[PDB]
Ligand binder design. Structure first.
Ligand code: NA
Lengths: 344, 344, 344, 344
């Protein structure tokens, strides 16, 4: 069919629409509840063998809105590619023990504070300057998809860390993905997405991709079909946004996605940083448009620094076939699967 | 079939292979020739109506290698998105009278100096504070695809500017595109590309896309077919690089594209900058992988600031259907067309 | 005396040493106490006339540690210059309703979340896309100046906002400045500093400088005298760090400051951004060394956009005498005063 | 007298004025002259012992304008801090065989091309994939200190490379420093500066500072005295710019420096990059104001990666006394000396 047929996993995206509904304001905030953190389990659990990497997800049913926390206890070297125009971010350290992704827009950054505080307690409040427990956080604005103003707070972040376990990730509406949505040319056509992950082991090489797509654009599959977002209930069709944009221009102008890619392959800070950018850009294949002024698109690239690539890039497949760029490209397909899991 | 069928123009990419051949090192440089600039006409000439924007292209047969210059006499606000890990850039100004694209790797930045010197002469050497004739230059490494070390020098850049005429662009092997090539997992599979352009007018809105793709990755069409690069002569097939990278890791790890988008729509510095990133990332659809450490990918987004978008984004197609993001997305498809013309 | 003599106001910095004491990187944390927020009054109250700008400061005696909040109810355009190698920053928005400075290293970023939560309550929980109350926060590591692990939390941040009043700032050991210290070539020579603010009105032009210096380097006055940090109790002398570093290299290699500048002068994003960098770099005069890999130096430049500079920069003092650069240089002196107040 | 007295070398700055005169445009350019390169010898030759680092400097009398080239044949890891708001840069590579500093504003970037083209010819046009000879260039606008439009062209950059010799730097009016000038609140008070260099060896540690100050601000010595720039011929006094700016505002608003630091101490890309920023910011001590919107301030930090620093930072002078921050501070003083040599 197309060039990527033989690496497509045939994810079974549900053709059924799930419009997010109209923007209804006046909803109750955090101070209207004795909020109870709930462990997020999603529609399905992904389980994977990546020692040292744990994941927790929690949500409030009041929202619904949640946080998803990637816990790497030992700490890991990190590059951040904040490429969107509306990025809400905390820390953005080049070394992290946890990455916290959350709804609630800028207010949801508080969840990450809950994680860092909890990690300090777990360190029993040791305060060496080279002993900081570092947490980077990113947020999506999910207030449009729901009639409540509840936001992931300190307690929910702490809960998410507490609910963290090795090698598991809740697919679908869970954690930060509870009220994520796509396709925002018009809110009438916006669909709920969710969060998604995917994992691959290549020999000893491990790659985990985590994504919470709350795009202005729509989610598309490797066949080039729009599978989530911009659904018109009148036509039953999901058109690529560019057709609405085209027509909007003819009429009126007459003459956020937060993600993480985690691997165990050793990369220098410059390799890791470019790796981050490559994989982030590859996501404009599965999300369109992407990296727009409206989006706060932020990808974290994390390495546990456990295995080395060969000193020379050579193989029987080519002289330049085993390096970071080859990895970022294998990783790009894992991330696309993760995006399709979120949109499934 | 796929979501972008209705905006695809059916560019007829030639199935016929054009491998670059193997790397032959030790050829003669500029010193070995009395180099005479040839005006580039390419396989075909695109003509477009965009007042104030001219293009010139020149090459040395002795390379073969060349330079392509976008000349906007009145000067135009510019944003630069230098994403790759191997960028060769000069100037990078937020306002430019010319953009110079050339082969010859870093040495070919000299062609842009030839343009700036020539423009200074034209201004009769005026050097007042606000009178700079600003030129931004970017290069590709095109020495692989030939057995000569001749690079675009000061003279060639000057020639390219002199050959510059309104509303024309030579498609294919012309200017900077004379020895551009794609698909470099192994040089045996590498194919010659070329340079390409496309133009679209929407009412008064104008969008020109110029591209010189010399990717590590390959060129792909909207159907998802690899149409240029990584051609295996033994199989007659162009596989997606990921399959080569995949097998290479199994075996060995057991357990540049320079482009410009030029429009006449008024955008603030922030909008133009984000517009550049969006359009640049969108190119990872037509080129894969893209923005890699091996690539010096650089896109210039240029506006002549001649027409306004409405103060509100609304239209019958949605409340957020007329803005810079909408424009960047219409522009993304013009650029894909340009990439296909280069790989045609 | 020196070029700046006529601009200096003879701030009376106390000659008396106040070494922080040997660091015990640890101690009782926030859970060991029932933390009671204390409105900070420091050693002295600075009173200024800048309508629209309020300041609150709070601390926990149990640290001691604290948070200082600048609250601009109407919101103001902001530029962030995060220059150090160990920055702890949340938000970093280009438009803020509050800036939150705090101790507690990264953990202290929680205080800023307390402010943003409060502000969302005050807005009775409206979450309109353009209704966000935005808060940017930065932190200093002040665990080395105390035998405690208490850090500014959500509650302390909220208190600081609550204690915020127009035109008042608590000089000295107050808010974020409670346990700030300077001069860390060795902790045995490290002195407590504090927080400081200065204010100047030029006609209608207003300039407020707020600073919390916790440098690796030392504070120095306009005469070039080290007046806080790197105090050697044996000699009674504060040497410039460079002499220690110099000696250290002969022997062993044989052959954070967070600040804000708030003004009412209209500046474009580009101008405000460059204004921020200029003022920030000017602080390497009063703090040496500065912008080091060990520091997380961050300056916020905030404008209430109320008065215009003339369209041309001319005056009797010169053709380039009235512009943003002129302002950033008037502002640089205000900020140096604030630094000296902090070290007083 | 002041904290730095003991590190000051008592550079004998000439008190005599050397006003640049006013900007007068319309003068003849390169086409009016049969330009021949002159090896710049300046007022005085600095000799230094730094194997592997050469310096060439050439100028055209007809400008007078020139280029200064730092040649490191073996190539060296580089970080670039381009702070200013009016930067003119070519290449900016993280690995360089030469750094080219020149007058002639953006047009002067052409001199760098002359270097690169000459290096290619030396390599005999070996275009090996990784045999690139990389040259990074920066420029100052010196067209305001002379009545000509002559700019450093390809031939002059070549000449500066060809005149390059080990361990020699021509102080004063030489190379890029021919028509550099300082203090530009008004052109009538602007003074010619020059270029400067200083060198220090600590054991086997070697630090070379090169600077071409063409500041909007004025050069100041360690005592805080204005020594070059803003000289009023009527008063015989050089005031600090802030006094002119301060008076300008009352009246009208009623109610580039390019430089390089070269060392042989091994630093990681992240260390080298922050080292660059620290040293660059330190220069606001000797140049005031600095890093302004009107300046294109660019500093290159280059390491030959020859000596290691200890694995721990400890010494008798303190726990944190031997590291890249310590080196960047030792380097800061070498750079200040070079600034004073330029203004001498
Ligand atoms: Na001539």
């Amino acid at each position: 069919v197309h060039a990527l047929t033989d690496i497509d996993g045939g994810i079974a995206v549900d053709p059924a629409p799930r419009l997010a509904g109209p923007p209804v304001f006046g909803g109750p905030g955090n101070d209207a509840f004795d909020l109870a953190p709930v462990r997020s389990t999603g529609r399905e659990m992904l389980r994977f063998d990546f020692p040292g990497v744990s994941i927790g997800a929690a949500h409030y049913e009041e929202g619904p809105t949640g946080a998803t926390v990637i816990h790497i206890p030992a700490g890991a070297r990190t590059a951040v590619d904040a490429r969107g125009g509306a990025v809400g971010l905390s820390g953005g350290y080049d070394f992290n023990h946890a990455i916290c992704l959350a709804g609630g827009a800028s207010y949801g950054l508080e969840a990450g504070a809950g994680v860092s505080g909890a990690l300090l307690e777990r360190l029993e409040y040791r305060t060496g300057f080279a002993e900081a427990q570092l947490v980077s956080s990113a947020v999506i604005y999910d207030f449009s998809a729901r009639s409540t103003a509840v936001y992931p707070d300190k307690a929910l972040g702490r809960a998410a860390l507490e609910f963290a376990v090795p090698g598991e990730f809740p697919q679908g509406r869970a954690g930060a993905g509870m009220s994520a949505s796509a396709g925002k040319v018009d809110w009438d056509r916006t669909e709920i997405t969710g969060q998604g992950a995917a994992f691959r082991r290549l020999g000893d090489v491990r790659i985990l991709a985590v994504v919470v797509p709350n795009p202005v654009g729509v989610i598309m599959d490797r066949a080039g079909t729009v599978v989530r977002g911009n659904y018109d209930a009148q036509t039953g069709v999901r058109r690529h946004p560019v057709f609405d944009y085209q027509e909007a221009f003819a009429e009126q102008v007459p003459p956020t996605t937060i993600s993480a890619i985690v691997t165990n392959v050793r990369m220098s800070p410059v390799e890791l940083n470019q790796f981050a950018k490559q994989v982030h850009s590859s996501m404009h294949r599965g999300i369109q448009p992407f990296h727009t002024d409206m989006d706060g698109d932020t990808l974290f690239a994390v390495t546990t620094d456990e295995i080395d690539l060969p000193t020379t890039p050579g193989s029987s497949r080519g002289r330049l076939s085993v390096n970071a760029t080859a990895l970022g490209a294998i990783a790009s397909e894992v991330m696309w699967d993760a995006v399709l899991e979120a949109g499934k």
